[PDB]
Amino acid sequence: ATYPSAKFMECLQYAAFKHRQQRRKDPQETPYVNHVINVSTILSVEACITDEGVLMAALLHDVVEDTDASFEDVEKLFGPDVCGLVREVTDDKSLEKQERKRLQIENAAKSSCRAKLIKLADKLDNLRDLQVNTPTGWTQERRDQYFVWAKKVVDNLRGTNANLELKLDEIFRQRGLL
Amino acid sequence: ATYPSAKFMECLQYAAFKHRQQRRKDPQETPYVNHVINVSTILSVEACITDEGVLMAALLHDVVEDTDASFEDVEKLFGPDVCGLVREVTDDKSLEKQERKRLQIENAAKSSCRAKLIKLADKLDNLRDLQVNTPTGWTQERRDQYFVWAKKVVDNLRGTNANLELKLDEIFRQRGLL
Ligand SMILES: [Mn+2]
Ligand SMILES: [Mn+2]
């Protein structure tokens, strides 16, 4: 006898709203909200996660970073409990495109068990979507480099979820990175 | 102490996938997934619904009718429990748009307590959207006719949620139908 709370729906609704104009960079140009959901869903379904603070955190694992939202909006809306994990998985968009990816490999291990979960999911889902389907106007080379970078981050996040990481490795095995 | 099940997430994901290409009729052309979400959230936050069966059904209240999904898919994936309500709120698309509306008023009050909840919220959300933005290429008269019809249907769905219906009325008296 389970069920999401009113806070979780107000969060799902929020991410949906706040990303309303953002789209995933694919041929179809599918809504970006799908991503965040795929990410939050991976943890629920695949990672069998039963804690909303993580499921809502994942729903917002790109708002304060790709939207015009702030940790405060999240804070005054969903509390510090989740403002923490959303901050723990948000990049400093004041740093150059590359400096953030390089920093993602370093700060990886230092993260928390809960934040590592989101980080792995964010990766897994992105990869699943990158296999075969190449981003809009994306160099075929660049398409590979992501895989290289993704694994480097995923390698410093290990020890978190056996199942998520497993599936991740299955994506690197096929491609030929391990 | 609560959290959404792995099924509600697979359902959220499914709704989001099947609708991926569908968009709402507004100037911005916002994703349709945002609508089904609002309907589920409308019940959760407002109306305070603690039953996933209804919540998922709401997330899927437009798939069987707009997307290429079927009752067997919902039945196969979520069960009669969810398949039963989703069918209770899906207009037979073999009929013409004008007839599908006429029946909504007739089969309205004949619906189940649970199915009325979705039907009400479904209306509330849409209406809320008709006050702010006007559908792409739509005359003001037709924009008005929707409110009238909405009321005729909602007038037969009443007796269900004193809160949703109270708000429904808020949209009807502000306009000038109540
Ligand atoms: Mn992401
Ligand atoms: Mn609808």
Swiss-Prot record, chains A, B:
Its cofactor is Mn(2+). SUPFAM superfamilies: HD-domain/PDEase-like (SSF109604). Its EC number is 3.1.7.2. GO terms for molecular function: guanosine-3',5'-bis(diphosphate) 3'-diphosphatase activity; metal ion binding. Pfam families: HD_4. Gene3D superfamilies: Hypothetical protein af1432. Keywords: Hydrolase, Manganese, Metal-binding. It is an enzyme of class 3 (hydrolase). It catalyses: guanosine 3',5'-bis(diphosphate) + H2O = GDP + diphosphate + H(+). GO terms for biological process: guanosine tetraphosphate catabolic process; response to starvation. The active site is at 65 (nucleophile), 66 (nucleophile). The keyword Cell cycle does not apply. The keyword Manganese applies. InterPro entries: HD/PDEase_dom (IPR003607), HD_domain (IPR006674), MESH1 (IPR052194). Mn(2+) binds at residues 35, 61-62, 122. Residues 32-127 form the HD domain. Disruption phenotype: Induces retarded body growth and impaired starvation resistance. Mutants have highly down-regulated DNA and protein synthesis-related genes and up-regulated stress-responsible genes. ppGpp hydrolyzing enzyme involved in starvation response. Belongs to the MESH1 family. This is Guanosine-3',5'-bis(diphosphate) 3'-pyrophosphohydrolase MESH1. The lineage of its organism: Eukaryota, Metazoa, Ecdysozoa, Arthropoda, Hexapoda.
